Design a protein around this nucleic acid. Structure first.
Lengths: 125, 95, 115, 217, 79, 69
RNA sequence: UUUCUCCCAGUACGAAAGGACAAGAGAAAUAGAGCCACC
RNA sequence: AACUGU
């Protein structure tokens, strides 16, 4: 079957510059594993993203339906949603700016979380 | 259909392609997906699906009808579809 | 239930959203075949005199059973390229967006709080 | 003897056989999943299987604010404020995806419906998700919280001040003048409390249900 | 174990680190003053030594060493 | 500066060991980022603020690299 | 009732570039006929 | 401009 270990090994084969994997406890109602990936260029991002899905489709998953690829339009961030794992593939410079690893390592303590601000909705007159 | 008076209704209508989820043999209750025209406690006419896909479903069913008098094999009191989760079954965990 | 007008709250760290502004927000367009916008539905929001795509993450309309009814309308901005405008989301976000049809992994990859 | 509301049938022309069949499924399911006794105002933690997540369960804690439905389709709603966001989740008692039900704090509130807590101050509605279960006395009635919540500015989701709602858990005096109550009282409909045509008795039905439920056990 | 081997190997791991300038990387090279190391700077300096020789050095006495020969002695007696 | 500078040596060293014990992620990025974390933050901090940073790292150390897998 | 996506399949075809059918599945939308377990 | 079944 298609599992975490198989994909990461495939990620190594296609030479992902950055791979980060965060497991999630059952209490949180989200994916068991969240994965963050990197690639040098958009062309590399497209190639690696396609490779994982192509390997996924070939590697059993007959019970599971085909997985559509998200973010291919963006040249800097591509994300593929598999059954038990989600891999987000981006550029190294794009990776550090978003700091996805901080989000999951620090579930609610990430620094950029505080940077969010609010707005208003008052009656004009 | 339910009549609404001058405003309507009270017209014969048919709903097609309703699957059966379960049948209670003791009380002869059939559990059918979807809604059926008419009010509660209203008599309805039930016949095998006439859709082209289900042209010949009686081959795997009692061809003339089910005869309890024959008693070839006593049926369970409650008949369930495979997907249906029977009560008293373990709580479903999405694994 | 996001629809015409419908004062909304921009849950994002985007510069336009983050900066306070006097004008109440009048959402323009709902990116759906139907006219009603619910959680996970793309919408167009006017912020700071500019138009930016937004993704609904909460609504005050009564919802289906076994789900939490939010007390405020929450949205997240998404760029044209598909990447979120803001790098962080503060309000708790339902995790149903993952299974919802569409591209929601990026926004979920930006949502710290999940309920 | 605490008879759960769902077992009590409502008046109507529905076949009694349906209730008997529905009760059998309810009673059989209760063996699989234990449904603890609780009342509106009690804080509960409910374990439910997560469909969106894969092989993961979660527990949600909130104060029970409303009970609705009957039979196998009965549902209960518990409210809480999480990350400053008020959330109300309607849990169906007999849904197979509810793994377990825990009454963290078994208690009652002034009103049988706590929807007005949305208009009340957030602190009255804020409850810690990780709060541990508090002790309970079996040979006692559930504790009744008589604290009167303070409302937010006059514009509310519903006009609780009206006699129709007749909420006894709201500090109307602080936020409403006596004249405003008189305006609200214009909808008193005093004849309604005196009308015997709107009275439905289930005491005999409730008593009969108890033996049937215990007999199934 | 060879004391000279540790002395030049300890010096080697000190030499490996780039931030510190080995203007005078003697066997008695000091850290706080000779190398001008902050409280954190000495940390990674010990860490490079720890990696080479099997770590297991605790800081309770490591920050007291203050020179490669002193850690050399501490390495020598613990191996 | 720190409440105890000894924790830092134990804290930092374990991170490097975990990187060599961290298979699924890219070891190269983990090493550079972790060294940045110490260099970016520990240069200047206050005792109270430093306590939070070191405390989170200690839990980060003691919880299988804080969930990094 | 109509539309979109998927699948078939990066296959057929084609020097490459590029890129299908039909059959099947899933999503919606509207129209029509209904329904009240839930909201 | 808000307000409200306009």
């Amino acid at each position: 079957k298609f599992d975490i270990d198989m994909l990461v090994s495939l990620l190594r084969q296609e030479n992902a510059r950055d791979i980060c994997v965060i497991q999630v406890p059952p209490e949180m109602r989200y994916t068991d594993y969240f994965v963050i990936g990197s690639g040098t260029s958009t062309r590399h991002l497209h190639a690696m993203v396609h490779y994982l899905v192509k390997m996924y489709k070939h590697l059993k998953c007959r019970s599971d339906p085909y997985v559509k690829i998200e973010g291919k339009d963006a040249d800097d961030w591509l994300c593929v949603d598999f059954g038990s794992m989600v891999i987000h593939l981006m550029l190294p410079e794009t990776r550090e700016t978003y700091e996805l690893e901080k989000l999951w390592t620090l579930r609610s303590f990430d620094d950029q979380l505080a940077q969010i601000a609010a707005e208003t909705l008052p009656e004009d007159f | 259909t339910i009549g609404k008076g001058f405003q309507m209704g009270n017209q014969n209508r048919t709903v097609y392609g309703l699957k059966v989820w379960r049948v209670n043999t003791k009380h002869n209750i059939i559990y059918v997906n979807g809604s059926v025209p008419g009010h509660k406690n209203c008599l309805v006419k039930i016949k095998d699906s006439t859709l082209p896909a289900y042209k010949d479903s009686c081959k795997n069913l009692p061809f003339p009808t089910y005869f309890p008098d024959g008693d070839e094999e006593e049926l369970p009191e409650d008949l369930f579809d495979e997907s249906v989760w029977q009560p008293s079954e373990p709580s479903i965990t999405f694994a | 239930a996001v629809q015409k007008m419908t004062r909304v709250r921009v849950v994002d760290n985007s510069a336009l959203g983050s900066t306070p502004y006097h004008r109440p927000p009048r959402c323009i367009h709902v990116y759906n075949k139907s006219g009603v916008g619910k959680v996970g539905d793309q919408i167009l929001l006017a912020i700071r005199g500019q138009k930016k795509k937004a993704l609904i993450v909460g609504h005050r309309m009564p919802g289906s059973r076994m789900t939490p009814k939010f007390d405020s309308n929450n949205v997240v901005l998404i760029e044209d390229n598909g990447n979120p405008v803001g790098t962080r989301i503060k309000i708790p976000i339902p995790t149903s967006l993952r299974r919802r049809e569409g591209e929601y992994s990026k926004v979920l990859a930006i949502a710290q709080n999940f309920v | 003897r605490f008879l759960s509301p769902e077992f009590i049938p409502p008046r109507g022309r529905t076949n009694p056989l349906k209730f008997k069949i529905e009760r059998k499924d309810m009673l059989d399911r209760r063996k699989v999943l234990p449904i603890p006794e609780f009342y509106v105002g009690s804080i509960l933690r409910v374990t439910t299987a997560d469909p969106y997540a894969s092989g993961k369960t979660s527990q949600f804690l909130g104060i029970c604010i409303k009970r609705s439905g009957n039979g196998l389709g009965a549902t209960f709603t518990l409210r809480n404020t999480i990350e400053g966001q008020g959330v109300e989740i309607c849990f169906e008692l007999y849904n197979p995806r509810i793994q377990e039900i825990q009454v963290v704090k078994l208690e009652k509130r002034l009103d049988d419906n706590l929807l007005y807590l949305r208009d009340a101050l957030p602190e009255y509605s804020t409850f810690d998700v990780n709060m541990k279960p508090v002790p309970q006395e079996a040979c006692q009635e559930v504790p009744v919280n008589k604290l009167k919540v303070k409302m937010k500015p006059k514009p509310w989701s519903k006009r609780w001040e009206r006699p129709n709602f007749n909420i006894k858990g709201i500090r109307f005096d602080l936020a409403l003048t006596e004249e405003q109550m008189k305006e609200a009282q214009k909808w008193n409909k005093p004849w309604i409390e005196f009308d015997m045509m709107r009275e439905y008795d289930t005491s005999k039905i409730e008593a009969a249900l108890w033996e049937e439920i215990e007999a199934s056990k | 174990l060879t004391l000279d081997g540790i002395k030049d190997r300890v010096l080697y791991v000190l030499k490996l680190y780039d931030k510190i300038d080995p203007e005078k990387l003697s066997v008695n090279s000091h850290f706080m003053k000779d190398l001008g190391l902050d409280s954190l700077d000495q940390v990674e300096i010990i860490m490079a030594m720890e990696d080479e020789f099997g770590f297991e050095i605790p800081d309770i006495d490591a920050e007291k060493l203050m020179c490669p020969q002193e850690i050399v002695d501490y390495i020598a007696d613990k191996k | 500066a720190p409440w105890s500078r000894e924790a830092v040596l134990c804290l930092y060293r374990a991170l490097l060991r975990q990187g060599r014990e961290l298979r699924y992620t890219d070891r190269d990025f983990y090493f550079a980022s972790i060294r940045r974390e110490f260099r970016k933050n520990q240069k200047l901090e206050n005792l109270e603020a430093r306590e939070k940073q070191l405390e989170k790292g200690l839990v980060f150390l003691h919880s299988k690299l804080g969930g990094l897998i």
